[PDB]
Design a protein around this ligand. Structure first.
Ligand SMILES: Nc1ncnc2c1ncn2[C@@H]1O[C@H](COP(=O)(O)OP(=O)(O)OP(=O)(O)O)[C@@H](O)[C@H]1O
Ligand SMILES: [Mg+2]
Lengths: 52, 554, 486
DNA sequence: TTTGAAAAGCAAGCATAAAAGATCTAAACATAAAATCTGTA
DNA sequence: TACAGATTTTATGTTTAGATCTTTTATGCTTGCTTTTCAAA
């Protein structure tokens, strides 16, 4: 998932994967993750309905 | 010192097969060599078919790309699930240079490098069959220099990895070649994720440009299961009449094959290979898959084969059906073992029969032969065939009940010991956590014997206090907690055991001796934890607090 | 072969690669280098720049004063002359090797007195009081590459042309292993030594290290602009190991500059000239006899102003030349003379020539700008008066300009000019977000150096600062009769 | 069935880590003319 | 020695991999007040 850049890091070249200073973030929009969650029948909207 | 070097070569000092002697070492070396050679013919018979299948994948896939590539805009091909390993061929088409250009994201940091590498490769390929500038005026002057027309086929490898702004600007750059009447351009995109992820990163005018003629091609090995079924059938015809496959093994194959999508066939080959190595390394009955070794029966073979549960069930059924006791004691065998290892086991041929009947007689192609074989093993083939709504009239022809044959447990591929899990797909960090927490399943408890008996090894003792602590640990309080577990008297007796070391004896009579020893061991274990990745110093120049990073059971 | 790039304009000099360590078989196989016609120097481009004139030049009485105050044409440098001359003379007569480091600010007579010491040494060697020597002058600011000094000095020593690394090994082998009886003494002037040491300290350390050799017979005079150049380019251990002579050159006082100027003008002041009354040509002694003078207080205040600021002879000589040029310009304009009783260079001419140096044109340039540019500067000054940041966003300047136009609606000038500023006086042009000539005056103030603008492609949040000061801007906008009342 | 009270939540302010990149250096990769070294002749 | 040819030397251009420092923004700590579920009467 990192080499496909659906997940991203804070640094892009010479990445230290095993350092605790390097953090991770998602790299897909809401529509992509929505159709991914409906592909597996996961209720991803239920974790966002009560928060806002 | 070589230990402090970056790298060094050792020319070892030389002062013959890795198979060992089974039957508690009482197996003959002839049987060991015969097991070795038997494993080699089975492995060769499987892997020749696997190599032929992989070559056929390459040939048919080049054929499909060559068909789609031929017969004022780009000609766009999207290869979905490509992994970009295939060598794309272009034909010989007279009065026209067909030049193929591979570009990777490493060769593409900006549009300038893309154009310079592309025109260098174009000029080199045109010269291979006066220096020039490596820019797009080489394209417009191509018929003036070389005399023939130009057909460029761009192959972008790992499109999910190239920066999309650079790729968009490169496509817009290549649009400028449409005003030359001697140039046609084809683009091949190796898409790994999906097409909707690609068009959300490209600009809308570029998508409108690419929409004029584009062709999608699912180039994955998962599509139709056509290549996995050939590999699994090749393994079945290797072991047909010799070895059986358990339902646990095939279910394990399916479960592991689901978890990897881009690289499925060689994972299947690796799993089947390791199961074959494990069987031929652990089982002394492997020589009996060849009928010429039936004179090699010894005592230890008989007491190993007498513990088979099929033999157990057969003899208790025999005492159920036969009232006299004289015939029962005669069997409790060497001649009865031989007559049943030559059975045909027609489940493999019937699996081939339903495979060819589903493929070539009902025009149904979306079936997994591994899943079909699992359903035939568990006895639910009808519950696998009642999905396509066309095997209803053929439900009674394809019926098969499983025959639990006698002494099949000595010739089968299973996983009830977890060896395939521990070797190919281990729970790596869970194994590290469980070896740290328990540690009596690693180090033996032999019965400095006293200090070894009543004090833990330092890393496990540190991990026991690490696991029960909070996210943020004070280092001094951690050292105070670690010092309480240690024996204050037996450690001081332990460092006085050797009278030759004088400085340690001098340090032992210090009134601050035990705290120094505890702090030294604590600091060494703390830096071992820091190197393993278990803790992290949340600072640069204090080193007073640490943060927990790893939790057991996650 | 298909190339990945081409280098089509490579011009390579025909310089050999073999150093002097391989010219002979052994150290005892080296002949007398003094008795060789290529060693130690044992200009054909003048006739390119030659032509014949048709008309005679009219040499005006002030042109003698101008020509005789040039830097191309040693009062006050006697202790420095004595120090350099005795160090070099004592090292030449003892066949030793030494180095003299001379430092100072530009124009204080460093190169001039080093050259005068060298010519006095050459004259003493012509009288056979000291043995003969070669003179090499190496200027660090007259090079393409700093290593070319290695190419130059060896070419002055041996007569052959080598590459710089081979020249460096050749000079090392020459100063180390060649015996003293087979070589000549060398005096090197290393002028502008900070130009040759910027990349690294190899040339400095090599030239200072060669003077520590017992066989070298080398005199290195190194001239620089800072004093701590050897102390910061080499360590204190190295500079203690060489032990160079250390000489500073302080700037001239006003009395020394005055003696320099009237020694340039010794034969011309209070002197008679035969002047052709129809052309203006003057001959030093239909023809008028004119005396020529420069007053003492003019030279006095010129040398007093120069010695306060810089203290160098070039500035004092040049303001005297500029005063003479101003006087000759007024003289030629008055008499109607061409190019082909008492004439004096007055105190006011020296005043005006000094005022061209002293004054700045920033305020004068800003008072002659257009209304839009002065509006920009006024809005900028208002913004740094309000928020006090010294960097203002361009959108804030736009809004402040719009607010200053909208507030002063009762003013006659703003009411007359607003249609010009926002529509270019035309009813077919829509009302613009910027004033007319907005980017024109922004680019003009950036080109003049009045402003500084950061590099940012958002034109609104991009920041701009005054690059001069706030007081010249305040003096400029208070001059304008429009801006100063609103 | 209450109850109360300590755990959890929240926010203003602030010191500090860290992201993003501007700027630069050096190594790998690449070419090229003059000099210099090799192998025959 | 002579000389064509191969290799070195010196000199410079092209591209990539990585280091350091600056500027702006995220992030965690502290302290004081407010809500909320669970251990106990
Ligand atoms: N003592 C002097 N007597 C007469 N003329 C002098 C004297 N000093 C300097 N000058 C004049 O000023 C010019 C500048 O002197 P010079 O070139 O020696 O300066 P410098 O200290 O080497 O300067 P820089 O550091 O700029 O090279 C000389 O060429 C000469 O015309
Ligand atoms: Mg000078």
């Amino acid at each position: 998932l990192h080499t496909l850049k659906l997940i991203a890091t804070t640094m892009n070249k010479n990445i230290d994967y095993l350092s605790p200073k390097v953090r991770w973030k998602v790299n897909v929009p809401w529509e992509i993750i929505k159709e991914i969650s409906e592909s597996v029948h996961f209720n991803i909207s239920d974790y966002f309905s009560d928060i806002h | 010192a070589d230990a402090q070097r970056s790298h060094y070569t050792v020319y070892p000092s030389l002062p013959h097969i890795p198979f060992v002697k089974l039957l508690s070492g009482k197996e003959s070396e002839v049987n060991v060599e015969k097991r070795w050679e038997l494993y080699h013919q089975l492995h060769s018979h499987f892997h020749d078919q696997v190599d032929h299948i992989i070559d056929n994948i390459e040939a048919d896939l080049k054929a499909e790309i060559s068909d789609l590539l031929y017969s004022r805009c780009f000609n766009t091909i999207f290869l979905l699930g490509s992994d970009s390993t295939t060598k794309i061929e272009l034909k010989d088409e007279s009065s026209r240079y067909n030049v193929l250009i591979e570009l990777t994201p490493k060769e593409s940091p900006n549009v300038r490098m893309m154009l310079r590498r592309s025109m260098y490769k174009l000029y080199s390929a045109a010269d291979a069959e006066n220096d020039v500038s490596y820019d797009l005026s080489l394209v417009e002057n191509f018929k003036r220099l070389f005399g023939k027309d130009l057909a460029m086929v761009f192959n972008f490898k790992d499109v999910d990895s190239i920066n999309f702004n650079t790729l968009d600007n490169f496509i817009i750059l290549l649009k400028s070649a449409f005003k030359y009447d001697h140039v046609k351009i084809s683009l091949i995109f190796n898409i790994n994720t999906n097409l909707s992820n690609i068009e959300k990163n490209l600009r809308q005018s570029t998508i409108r440009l690419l929409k004029r003629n584009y062709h999608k091609l699912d180039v994955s090995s998962n599509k139709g299961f056509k290549y996995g079924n050939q590999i699994f059938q090749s393994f079945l015809d290797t072991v047909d009449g010799k070895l059986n496959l358990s339902d646990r093994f095939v279910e394990f194959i399916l479960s592991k094959m689901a978890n990897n999508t881009n690289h499925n066939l060689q994972l299947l080959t690796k799993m089947l290979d390791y199961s074959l190595m494990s069987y031929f390394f652990q089982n002394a009955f492997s020589v009996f898959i060849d009928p010429v070794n039936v004179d090699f029966l010894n005592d230890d073979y008989l007491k190993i084969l007498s513990r088979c549960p099929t033999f157990m069930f057969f003899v208790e059924g025999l005492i159920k059906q036969h009232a006299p006791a004289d015939e029962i004691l005669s069997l409790l065998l060497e001649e009865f073992f031989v007559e049943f290892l030559v059975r045909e086991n027609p489940i493999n041929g019937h699996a081939k029969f339903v495979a060819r009947f589903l493929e070539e007689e009902l025009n149904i192609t979306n079936f997994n032969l591994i899943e079909l074989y699992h359903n035939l093993l568990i006895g639910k083939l009808d519950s696998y065939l009642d999905r396509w709504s066309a095997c209803k009239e053929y439900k009674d022809r394809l019926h098969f009940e499983p025959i639990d044959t006698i002494f099949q447990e000595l010739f089968t591929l299973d996983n009830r010991s977890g060896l395939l899990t521990q070797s190919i797909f281990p729970s790596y960090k869970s194994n590290i956590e469980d070896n740290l927490l328990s540690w009596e399943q690693v180090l033996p408890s032999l019965d400095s014997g006293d200090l070894d008996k009543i004090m833990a090894p330092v890393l496990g003792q540190l991990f026991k206090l690490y696991r029960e602590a909070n996210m943020t640990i004070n280092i001094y309080d951690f050292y105070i907690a670690f010092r309480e577990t240690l024996p204050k008297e037996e450690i001081l007796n332990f460092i006085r055991k050797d009278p030759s070391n004088t400085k340690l004896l001098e340090l032992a009579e210090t009134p601050d001796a035990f705290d120094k020893v505890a702090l030294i061991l604590f600091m060494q274990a703390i830096f071992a934890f820091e190197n393993m990745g278990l803790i992290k110093f949340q600072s640069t120049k204090s080193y007073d607090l640490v943060e927990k990073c790893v939790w057991r059971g996650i | 072969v298909i190339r990945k790039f081409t280098k089509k304009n490579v011009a390579r000099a025909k310089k050999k690669y073999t150093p002097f360590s391989k010219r002979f078989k052994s150290i005892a196989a080296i002949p007398d280098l003094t008795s060789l016609p290529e060693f130690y120097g044992n200009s054909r481009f003048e006739n390119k720049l030659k032509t014949t004139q048709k008309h005679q030049i009219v040499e005006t009485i002030f042109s003698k004063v101008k020509k005789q105050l040039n830097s191309s044409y040693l009062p006050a440098r006697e202790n420095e002359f004595a120090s350099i001359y005795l160090s070099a003379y004592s090292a030449i007569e003892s066949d030793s090797a030494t180095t003299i480091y001379v430092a100072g600010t530009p124009g204080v007579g460093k190169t001039l007195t080093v050259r005068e010491v060298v010519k006095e040494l050459l004259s003493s060697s012509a009288q056979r009081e000291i043995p003969d020597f070669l003179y090499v002058e190496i200027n660090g600011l007259k090079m393409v590459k700093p290593t070319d000094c290695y190419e130059t000095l060896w070419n002055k020593v041996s007569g052959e042309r080598l590459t710089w690394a081979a020249s460096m090994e050749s000079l090392e082998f020459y100063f180390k292993r060649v015996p003293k009886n087979k070589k000549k003494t060398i005096v090197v002037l290393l002028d502008e030594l900070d130009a040759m040491v910027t990349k690294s300290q190899d040339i400095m350390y090599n030239f200072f290290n060669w003077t520590t050799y017992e066989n070298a017979k080398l005199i290195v005079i190194a001239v620089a602009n800072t004093m701590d150049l050897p102390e910061r380019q080499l360590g204190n251990k190295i500079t203690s190991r060489i032990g160079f002579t250390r000489i500073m050159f302080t700037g001239y006082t006003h009395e020394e500059l005055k003696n320099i100027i009237d020694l340039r003008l010794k034969g011309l002041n209070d002197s008679f000239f035969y002047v052709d009354t129809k052309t203006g040509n003057a001959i030093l002694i239909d023809v008028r006899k004119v005396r020529l003078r420069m007053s003492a207080d003019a030279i006095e205040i010129a040398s007093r102003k120069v010695a306060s600021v810089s203290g160098d002879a070039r500035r004092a000589l040049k303001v005297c030349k500029r005063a003479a040029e101003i006087a000759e310009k007024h003289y030629m304009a008055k008499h109607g003379y061409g190019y082909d009783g008492v004439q004096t260079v007055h105190i006011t001419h020296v005043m005006k020539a000094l005022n061209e140096t002293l004054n700045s044109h920033v305020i004068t340039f800003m008072t002659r700008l257009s209304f839009t540019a002065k509006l920009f500067i006024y809005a900028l000054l208002n913004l740094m008066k309000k928020n006090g940041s010294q960097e203002q966003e361009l959108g804030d300047i736009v809004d402040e300009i719009k607010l200053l136009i909208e507030v002063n609606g009762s003013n006659k000038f703003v009411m007359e000019i607003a249609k010009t500023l926002f529509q270019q006086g035309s009813d077919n042009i829509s009302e613009q977000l910027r004033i007319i000539s907005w980017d024109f005056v922004l680019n003009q103030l950036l080109d003049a150096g009045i402003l500084f603008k950061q590099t940012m492609k958002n034109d609104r949040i991009c920041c701009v600062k005054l690059n001069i000061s706030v007081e010249e801007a305040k003096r400029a906008m208070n001059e304008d009769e429009t801006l100063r009342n609103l």
